[PDB]
């Protein structure tokens, strides 16, 4: 029997390369009346044209699998979706080549879609390994608010929760904004000096400019960016010493095409040695039924361990994403990028080059600055923490205990009355009690200073269900920690 596999490409030369690859492939393995040919088609601007053209291609012959590649252009995740939408109703597998977006990883949206390169939200393993290597324990996320960054943030959160060490803070800024300075001021000096950035190109440029205006790119900070914000116009403004990641062979599509041809050839040859098979339907106007060439083909395609080829070992996980990839940890020096290491998928082996950390110097900054200033929250109580309004000038009046000692006092900054609901004003009082002098002794022994302010809500804190949401958050004084 003769079975053919079609594809859509971006240039005529790629079509000739595909023809040569399939000609080389079919002249191997077995020849039990098996002959496969390649049918190609170029790209068109509008997506409905892609839909009609691809269903006409399906009409031409019973295509067992389709190869798709994103043309060289901006992200534009709308280019590959018409093929997946059209072929999904027939439930025929579709092979992707260069689309690295993480939206397609959802099983519900795309039931049949295979990827040959790891997605954008898949480099968090590299960051975790690098943190383990350089003994970094505190990080500050800066993920932008979009569907792309949610997967990365949740994967990193789960991976950190494996070790019972959560991220210090996660920030979110709206995409396509114009002034993000408030967030950077808020997160400039919390506890940590390791910034992990993942956003779009323009947002990355805005963040870079804002950070450069705040004098945060100086010595004592370590940047760890993804892949997108190292190429394009992101190099117009970028502090020296950023450590980005790059795919080893993300542009040489010929090797990917050859490996895909080989793996699907092996899969179809293995599948054809069975019983109870049918063919996908011919014509995008005649039949409206699910092709029986369905989940069995995908299941046998997933378990297709390949020994050694032009890119390395090929193994598919239960996510439709290629595993065991190679990453090139690289550093930027004096507006010129250079290689610093290699990620083989197990660990990272340093090369014979010394990194240049931001702000100059070569000392591997510890990335943790301790702040000897704590904000301490207390609540009103009868025998523990009294509250007495201060006198007119501002300083508290003196008091004497029966045995004759000057009871120590500190100045609180809590709201008055019962709640700041109607009046949104806070008047400085000063509080003394049984816990305050213990805190004084702790501060004296501990060699730090303090600053105490009351709690606005006034409750001790319990887990309360959010308003029509599936997330549980704390409240009151318990929620201010």
């Amino acid at each position, epitope marked *: 029997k003769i079975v053919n596999i079609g594809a859509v490409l971006s240039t005529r030369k790629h079509e000739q390369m595909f023809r040569e690859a399939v000609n080389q492939a079919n002249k191997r393995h077995g020849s039990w009346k098996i002959q496969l040919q390649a049918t190609s088609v170029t790209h068109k601007p509008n997506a409905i044209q892609m839909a009609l053209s691809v269903c006409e291609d399906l009409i031409s012959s019973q295509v067992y699998a389709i190869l798709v590649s994103h043309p060289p252009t901006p992200n534009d995740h709308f280019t590959p979706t018409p093929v997946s939408y059209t072929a999904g109703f027939y439930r025929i597998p579709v092979l992707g080549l260069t689309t690295r977006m993480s939206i397609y990883s959802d099983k519900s949206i795309h039931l049949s879609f295979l990827r040959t390169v790891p997605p954008y939200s898949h480099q968090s393993s590299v960051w975790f390994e690098m943190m383990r290597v350089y003994n970094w324990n505190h990080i500050i996320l800066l993920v932008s608010d979009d569907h792309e960054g949610r997967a990365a943030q949740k994967r990193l959160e789960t991976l950190l929760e494996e070790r019972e060490s959560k991220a210090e803070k996660v920030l979110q800024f709206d995409p396509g904004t114009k002034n993000v300075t408030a967030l950077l001021m808020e997160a400039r000096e919390l506890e940590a000096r390791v910034i992990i950035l993942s956003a779009s190109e323009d947002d990355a440029a805005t963040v870079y400019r804002a950070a450069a205006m705040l004098d945060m790119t100086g010595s004592g900070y370590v940047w760890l960016v993804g892949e997108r914000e190292i190429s394009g116009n992101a190099l117009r403004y970028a502090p020296d010493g950023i450590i980005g990641l790059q795919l080893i062979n993300g542009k040489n599509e010929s090797a990917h095409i050859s490996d895909a041809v080989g793996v699907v050839a092996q899969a179809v040859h293995e599948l054809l040695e069975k019983e109870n098979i049918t063919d996908p339907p011919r014509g995008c106007v005649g039949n409206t039924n699910i092709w029986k060439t369905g989940p069995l083909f995908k299941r046998v395609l997933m378990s297709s361990k390949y020994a050694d080829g032009v890119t390395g070992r090929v193994e598919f996980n239960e996510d439709g994403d290629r595993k065991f990839a190679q990453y090139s940890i690289m550093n930027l*020096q004096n507006r010129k990028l250079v290689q610093v290491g290699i990620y083989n998928g197990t660990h990272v082996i340093p090369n014979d080059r010394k990194i240049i950390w931001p702000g100059g110097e070569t000392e591997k900054p510890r990335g943790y600055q301790m702040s000897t200033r704590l904000k301490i929250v207390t609540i009103h109580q009868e025998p523990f923490v009294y509250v007495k309004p201060t006198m007119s000038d501002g300083t508290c009046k003196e008091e004497f205990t029966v045995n004759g000692d000057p009871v120590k006092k500190v100045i609180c900054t809590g709201p008055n009355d019962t709640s700041p609901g109607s009046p949104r004003h806070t008047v400085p009082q000063c509080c003394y009690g049984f816990c305050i002098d213990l805190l004084i002794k702790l501060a004296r022994t501990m060699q730090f200073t303090y600053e105490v302010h009351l709690v606005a809500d006034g409750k001790f804190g319990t887990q309360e269900r959010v308003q029509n949401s599936n997330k549980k958050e704390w409240n009151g004084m318990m929620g201010e920690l």
Partner: antibody
Amino acid sequence: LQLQESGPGLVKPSQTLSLTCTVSGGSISSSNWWSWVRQPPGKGLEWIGEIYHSGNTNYNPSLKSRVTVSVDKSKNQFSLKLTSVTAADTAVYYCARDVSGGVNWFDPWGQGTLV
Amino acid sequence: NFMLTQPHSVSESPGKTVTISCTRSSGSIASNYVQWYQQRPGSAPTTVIYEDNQRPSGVPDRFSGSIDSSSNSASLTISGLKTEDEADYYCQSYDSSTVVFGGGTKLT
């Protein structure tokens, strides 16, 4: 700050050149890179290499395995040891230092050699 | 890498405004920018403008520069021609792997 061009100077072919540049008014233990721009007579400019005081180097892909530039921390001087010099690459060699900043801003330029 | 071309055969009358252009052969000159170096005959080249907008600390304000982002060429404008104008002017850009120097230009 001032960069003073120096070096022995040779015109013989099929040898290895060795020129060293001294700096006055500044210290090489800084954050500024050091350039070695070469000037062919009657022509424009072409970049050669940069050296950081830490020790790492940055060369040109064309002449990758033919030019080596190193520095001497104790003597406060760097040098160029271009090897396998032919008779068709004679030129005048310039010593220049740029500012780190976020740009490449090679200035001020040195006196320049005449090899 | 790429190449740069400049009109090295431009020389107008004294007391006039002239514009010099450095063109980028390959790529789009919109992320990495260019600075101009002036070389007097018998000395070392000196910078006259960097960042394409701000002149160095101490220089006449007659010289100016701008870009079009359409023809992939950067234009440097000099006004009020005088005796202090006969010099070799060069443009230098850079991709993110090497450094690229222009052909150069001079006026009489």
